[PDB]
Amino acid sequence: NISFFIDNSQTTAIEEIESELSSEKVDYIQEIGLVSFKNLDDSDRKFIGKYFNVSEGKKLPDFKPENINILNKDFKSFNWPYKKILSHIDPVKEQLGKDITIALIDSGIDRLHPNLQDNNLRLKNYVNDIELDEYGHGTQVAGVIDTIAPRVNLNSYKVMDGTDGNSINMLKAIVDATNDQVDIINVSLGSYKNMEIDDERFTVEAFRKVVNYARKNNILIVASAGNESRDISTGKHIPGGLESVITVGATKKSGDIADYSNYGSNVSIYGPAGGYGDNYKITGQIDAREMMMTYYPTSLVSPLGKAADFPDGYTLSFGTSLATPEVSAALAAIMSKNVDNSKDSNEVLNTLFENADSFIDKMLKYKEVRIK
């Protein structure tokens, strides 16, 4: 792709280009003055070239993923992350998340999952006409949300088929979710690559603009810190780690930062999201008890879920992608309790941090999400 920022003085140029080129070659985001072109031929480049300098176009990066009651004691080996953050709260009794809408910008969601029939699911697909959650990631994220804040509404923004997506679709989905009036945007996806530095400056600015657009509309964005076991504050991971993003790392069952989790001063908060266990680095084996139970598409087979004797629709997983929705659900719980005593997003955000508990990693001090 080649991407440009378009000034308000140049909007007629984009109109003329959109009229000339096939719609599937042009993605224009009015709200942030961004256009991105793909699959161009020589004729298309020549036409664009009479308004912009094609050689100055920047490349936006690709990104990657980062009745049964999970809270039942049948799953005590695997539901430990939820018990840690909920303590004794019964999310169903408290109707947590009622009338709050979370955008899941992810791989889609299994609309047939038996536990996702009460979330007023709304689906949008940016990539194809396949209505499935093709590889299961968005459904895993939705399961974390639904376990903690079961009464939320879910808007799914499917921005990837398989495991590699184009960031233009993530940017579009953030703006579309804002325009859809969601309350919280969850992004359990990220890019972190030795980008060419000018492409990276461009991409960081594009994300600053979409994040600011959401925040100005009083919407909080929660994003994964990533799973590279890196300090993302030493120079960019995108969007987790950027200004104005609530960036979520993962802790493992011992309470320490998980072996894969990114960390650093631009990671806002952590949530328990499990992992393979301490013996994995030695034997290559996964300790299922160190993993986290969540949903999985009924259209797929989970090997660890089957080995744990789960019904279809459930898996054992890990990742900052699972800690992120714990925070989105925490925010939704704060918001659902403030219907008649309205708090704005700034105050909700500060409440999230006040409610978190501090921990020391095996040696800095960090915050871990708690539901109240």
Author numbering: 30 to 95, 103 to 271, 274 to 400, 403 to 412
Provide the authors' own sentences about this structure as they appear in the paper:
The enterococcal cytolysin is a two-component lanthipeptide secreted by Enterococcus faecalis that functions as a virulence factor. CylA is a subtilisin-like serine protease that is essential for toxin activation. Like many proteases, CylA is translated as a proenzyme that undergoes activation through self-cleavage.
The cleaved domains co-eluted as a single species suggesting that the pro-domain was tightly bound to the protease domain. Formation of the interface buries ~1270 Å2 of surface area as determined using the Proteins, Interfaces, Structures and Assemblies (PISA) server. The side chain of Glu95 at the −1 position is within hydrogen bonding distance of the side chains of Ser260, His275 and the backbone amide of Gly262. The side chain of Asn263 and the backbone amide of Thr275 are positioned to provide an oxyanion hole to stabilize the negative charge accumulated in the transition state. Notably, the −4 residue (Phe92) is directed into the catalytic domain where it is engaged in van der Waals contacts with residues in a pocket composed of Val195, Met196, Met206, and Leu225.
